[PDB]
A and B are shown apart, each in its own frame.
Chain A
Amino acid sequence: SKAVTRHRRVMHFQRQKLMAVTEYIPPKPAIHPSCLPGLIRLLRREIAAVFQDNRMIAVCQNVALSAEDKLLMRHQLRKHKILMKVFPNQVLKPFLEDSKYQNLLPLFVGHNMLLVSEEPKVKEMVRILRTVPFLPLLGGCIDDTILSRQGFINYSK
């Protein structure tokens, strides 16, 4: 058999013993190492500007709609100067403690959309929400005073 073959040629036995003795040994540490120890500021400036803007705020669980249905809700609230805002609560949890909202820290989680306002059409917004047997009103906060949904009935009325 030639020195170059098509199959891996069988080594001489001392060749093979050399190859086994001179194998690579990796280092072993005494302790395993794994067992040892722009858009963000766009949201901060934008939503922080929305904090100082609104006198009244409300919020819902606006995930339970269709696209054209959210277009209808977008137009029926476009009829007012109220604004709706889908934004991550991931950044909104440091937003509240920045804006000194300690009663609003247990408010903003899961799917939610802001209803920031200065003029309450929120009674008529409830009039739009009464025809759909879901999507409840989550509590707001006008001028560092919290609004329960009962408070939305009282203030909205």
Chain B
Amino acid sequence: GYVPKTSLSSPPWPEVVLPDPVEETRHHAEVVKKVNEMIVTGQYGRLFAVVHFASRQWKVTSEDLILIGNELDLACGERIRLEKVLLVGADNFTLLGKPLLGKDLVRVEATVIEKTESWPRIIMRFRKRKNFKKKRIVTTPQTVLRINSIEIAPCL
């Protein structure tokens, strides 16, 4: 089944040889052990989590703010554990879940600061030659969360 080396003999992409799963699962065990040592001995600096709060993914560090487009029905000042964190990164490692991380691994806290309304937000409809002109003004409720801490735990 030999073909001599022409342009179209072989495919143009170079072949990759993926490593065998014995040495590769052993290698993964080495890496997870390293990173778990960095989480034990506290080598990391500040973290960022990607959190699936509400309907969307917020990339988040500690000490910041998120404006959410609905009333959460909590009192201002209440702390909240955001579940559904799906990426956690430090300077030298990340951890990403399939699709979410373990609750025993990462803990993201956030307080409610304020519960506002939005700025007034116009909804106008108009069709020409039809005398069709409606106007509405909508303000959605909003709450602001202050992410207090992303604490990480050695559970690998």
| Contact flag (A, B; Cβ within 8 A) | no
